[PDB]
Amino acid sequence: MADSELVAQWEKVQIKTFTKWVNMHLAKKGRKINDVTTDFKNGVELCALLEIIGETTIKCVTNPKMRIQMTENLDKALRFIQSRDVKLTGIGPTDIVDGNVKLTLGLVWTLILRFAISELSAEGLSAKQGLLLWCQKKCEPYPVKVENFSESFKDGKVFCALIHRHRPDLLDWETVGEDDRANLEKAFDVAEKELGIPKLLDVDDIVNMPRPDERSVMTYVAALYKVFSSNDQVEKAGKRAGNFLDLLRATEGMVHDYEQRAQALKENIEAAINKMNGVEPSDEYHQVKEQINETKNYRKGDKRAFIKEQGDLATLFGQINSKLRGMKRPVYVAPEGLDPKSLEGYIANISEAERALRSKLNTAMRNCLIALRKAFADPANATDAKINEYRTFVTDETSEAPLEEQVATLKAKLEELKQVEAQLPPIEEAEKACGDANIEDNEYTDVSFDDLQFNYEQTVSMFEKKIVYIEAQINEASSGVTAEQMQEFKQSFDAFDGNHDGILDKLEFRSCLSSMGLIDIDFTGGEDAQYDAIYNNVTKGENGVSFDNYVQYMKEKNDENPSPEQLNEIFSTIAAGKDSITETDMQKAGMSAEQIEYVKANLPQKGDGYDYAAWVKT
Amino acid sequence: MADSELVAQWEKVQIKTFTKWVNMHLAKKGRKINDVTTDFKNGVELCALLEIIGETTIKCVTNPKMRIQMTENLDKALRFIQSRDVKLTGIGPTDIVDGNVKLTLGLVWTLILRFAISELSAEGLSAKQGLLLWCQKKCEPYPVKVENFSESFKDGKVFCALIHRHRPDLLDWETVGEDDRANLEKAFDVAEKELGIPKLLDVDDIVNMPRPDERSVMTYVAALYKVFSSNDQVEKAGKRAGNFLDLLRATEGMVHDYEQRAQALKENIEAAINKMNGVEPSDEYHQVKEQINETKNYRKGDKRAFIKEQGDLATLFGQINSKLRGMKRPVYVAPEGLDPKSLEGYIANISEAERALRSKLNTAMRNCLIALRKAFADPANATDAKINEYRTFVTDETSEAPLEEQVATLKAKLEELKQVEAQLPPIEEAEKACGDANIEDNEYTDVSFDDLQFNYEQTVSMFEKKIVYIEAQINEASSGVTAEQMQEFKQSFDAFDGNHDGILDKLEFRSCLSSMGLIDIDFTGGEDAQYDAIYNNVTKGENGVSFDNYVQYMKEKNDENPSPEQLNEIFSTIAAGKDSITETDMQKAGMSAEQIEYVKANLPQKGDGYDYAAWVKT
Ligand SMILES: [Ca+2]
Ligand SMILES: [Ca+2]
């Protein structure tokens, strides 16, 4: 009969915990019982416990005098119990009054089930088993087995499981799983101070006993169910889902922003490649420079922005994926061809498009450059060569032809070279072009434009000179001008003829004459009127100065000059016979001091006089 | 006796002309004679003729009464004649009184010689012959023979010769040489109106006679000699030499000016060639451009001036030579090596020096150019190639080596490439150089500097990424971070780390957190003080943010996130058992409208509720 001590010990525990359960409710009305087996005998404490948990007015006798009134009290109380789905055919009021142990404890038992765990029953499952299923489901991750209401809860790691499964903030879990005194005390303490569940079970007489009482344990779990089921626990569970949903919702915002922007970037890179593939490399320099310059704006602007953006997105996609890795949720997969690895390839492309464009533009500029240099070099080299061929021709004097023919030949060859004059202003333009295009190296020619202009002018003037000199040779008999002499007239005349019309202007002629100093008249209140008349005298009409008129004048002025014999007479007459010319003779003759000085300077002296034999020598 | 009519005829002419000579002198005192043979008989007219030509007072009887007084008169007159060198031993006063023809005419003759042509006699030459020599010398260019005083002067072209030889302004010469009446009348007329010589010879009785009288002709020539000998004729001859000397003197000025200037030009061209031959073609671009530019100043300035000056001088030398050709004088020969043909060669030279210099400068610029392009192209091509070799290496995943070794290998190869970073700023400088030197074509490379910088940065970042990911693989067991997961942390952290010190600044960290939105706290009067404390919480000291600290925080934040089973409970508790979550449950649970919207948006609906089987699925 050892299986008799265990039955008793349990009764001692089941009386403690069923008492601890009644006054937990009675307390809300200030009432209290000491022992369920003895304090329910008068009926009063049961009726008042029923009125608090059931919320109905039962007005029983507070001080029952006779066993009849105690019984009277219980019938009113038993009517209330029976009305709710409870079976009470077995028990009568007579024995609950007597204070019968197991029937009182069986009645306290029936009420508990109705008022704490009746909700659990599920068409094929008793109150005990539906509560057991509720324990079982809430303990799936935990290293406990929940198999009965005695053996399973002895350990007490199942009591801790029920609090951590519902509220992980109140008792941390991996600090559970060794001591049986500890984990229980911690759990009963947690339900007492923070859940408001009174310590209905003693910590010491569950650890001391081989198996705890099944009914006592069930009472506590039911109380635990009501607190965790409580409205406030639902509210706590609201805030928790809130926190989790909100993070996903901010993360929705993050995936939307990335999507809008990733698309944008893909589109923009695409736009750029169309532009780049589209542009066609110019033949013209200022255009190609402009095309080159264009690329530099992109490299400077957009290109920079496109790299940065792809960066930022690779950032965003990574960050977003971290957050879902963090939430234990599945990773974000970006729409086909908007993953960042895809995105990076797009950058690759426009980099590939740029490199192909500028290289294409590079050869353009190179080619353009070459063409520009040859646009001045090939003509100028053709032209330098032409003038030179004609230079050599006028330089050649091996001809054995008649002079009149040589003149005709010359003027004929002159025309050709004169024709060249028009090609000069195009080549000047082509050199200037090379200048604008910034080239300070030619490489195809040494020659310059100014060299061409100067060489041409010289060769043209060279022809003009040889023409006149052979024309004056032809004319020597006819007009008494030394061929040689004529050159000098042509030479002088040309060089004042400011235009090249071979006629001197009234202004233009005066300077020529003024140069040679033939106009003795100077200043005198500007007494150049004589010139008005001299101009007219020279030009018979003529409204300008003829080369022939010019020459006429000069021949006329030359005729005024005495011959050397005629010169001799003048001196003879000065000296009155003697060849020696004394200073006194000249002074008496009236000559200016300066004239005398020249005579002395220029004439060899014999004795007291100056001989003039050498001047007459010819 | 025909040679008797000629002797008479002559006497008739010699009386006319000897009379015409006496009263020419007598006129100056108002006195006059009609005939020398009859009016000298009284002596008075002779004495008075003697007193005018001799300038001495003889006071003879004006009205001689007796043949004795007439004779008396002549003795006084004959004393005066004899005193001057004259021979008069033959003639007496008695016969001159009688009126003897040939002796009177012989006495008139002797006086004429003394008072008009005595000057001519020259120790071996009679008065007649010295006068004849004087005629002979003054008629050297003329087509006359002067052989006697009769036959030679008959023609009269010798009388014209004497006036043109002395004064060519009064009777022009080539309008002489046909008519004998004409040329004589013109000459006698010229001496009458402009010389003041009276027509002592009749024009008609020299043309009518076979030979004119020798003595009559001589009388006129003597008179002609005195007028041409006259002071005023000397003065006229002064002005004439003046005019000729002065022209030479102005011409002296012209040869001096040319000489000073021709020298100058020769010297200056010389100076210029020394400069040109002296300059040495630079290796450096800005210098060579400067050397090129220098030439352009000369071509623009001096060169122009040197051509002009040589022109002007060729003008001056020609003009001067014309004037001496004009003066019948010998031509000016310029000092050896200052003739204009010489001068033109000097211009040739400096043109030759210029062409050699700029060509030499041209190849310089060409070379300079090439060097400059290769100074960027060869390094950049070396560098593009290096980075790419390292790119391929990090791209290679064929390795079968241990991970720890692969990490060591990687960081080791990373150092090398990190070293390159310093070569980048030199190549940027070398590209910029090419830019200043105005080259928009390269030709030796397609590559750019920005391409190098970007490719480098990408490859360096590529290494950093693969290092951390293999390091997180190695660490997975130790620290419960998905290798993959760690990247995201590194990825995010790096991208806010504004410097590259792998530590985030207080400012720098806040942005990172702010980005992810983990800091719920915002605005509230700037209530970021919590952050002060959160920063400190993250960084234990630490005065910055550790990558390990960063990661710690994130693991900490990740741990706060419930598992999918833990998520299930929260929903179970909301729904109080049923899997279907109604809107009302969530509203009663207290959840925000937005949370509810997300639930509906994200969760498949069964009946009246929203299932959460898929979220728990994992
Ligand atoms: Ca003109
Ligand atoms: Ca930093």
XYZ file of C-alpha atoms and ligand atoms in Angstrom, chain B residues 493 496-505 508, ligand 2:
13
model
C 29.412 50.637 -45.637
C 29.134 55.869 -47.502
C 32.636 55.901 -46.245
C 33.378 59.192 -48.090
C 37.147 58.918 -47.642
C 38.499 55.390 -48.103
C 39.723 54.726 -44.567
C 37.204 51.937 -43.928
C 35.732 53.684 -40.833
C 32.499 55.729 -40.828
C 32.319 59.273 -39.288
C 28.944 59.593 -42.177
Ca 35.416 57.366 -43.276
